């Protein structure tokens, strides 16, 4: 289940190791627009929160 538009959810993910290839492999995910970082570099950074 996903929430409604007028009351959108917010989940905080922390203290783990981030792998993004699972995203690309499973399902097309047709739109993957990113506004501050190129997707191919997402594996070579570290995130605050």
């Amino acid at each position: 289940r996903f929430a409604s538009v007028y009351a959108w959810n917010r989940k905080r993910i922390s203290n783990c190791v981030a792998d993004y290839s699972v995203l690309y492999n499973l399902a097309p995910f047709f739109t993957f627009k990113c506004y501050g970082v190129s997707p191919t570099k997402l594996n070579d950074l570290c995130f605050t929160n």
Binding site: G36, V37, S38, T40, K41, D44, L45
Partner: protein, 49 residues
């Protein structure tokens, strides 16, 4: 370069290269005018000596 893909990354660094060149162009030009101002004093100093 770490966060951006190769093509856009240049777009951004173009702003910095032209931005920083404009900083050096201003610096050199200010020096040229100051150098001529010192020379007119040096020639006056040579004249008095």
């Amino acid at each position: 370069f770490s966060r951006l893909d190769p093509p856009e990354a240049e777009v951004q660094i173009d702003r910095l290269i032209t931005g920083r060149l404009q900083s050096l162009q201003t610096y050199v030009t200010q020096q040229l005018i100051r150098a001529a101002e010192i020379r007119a004093s040096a020639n006056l100093a040579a004249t008095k000596m």
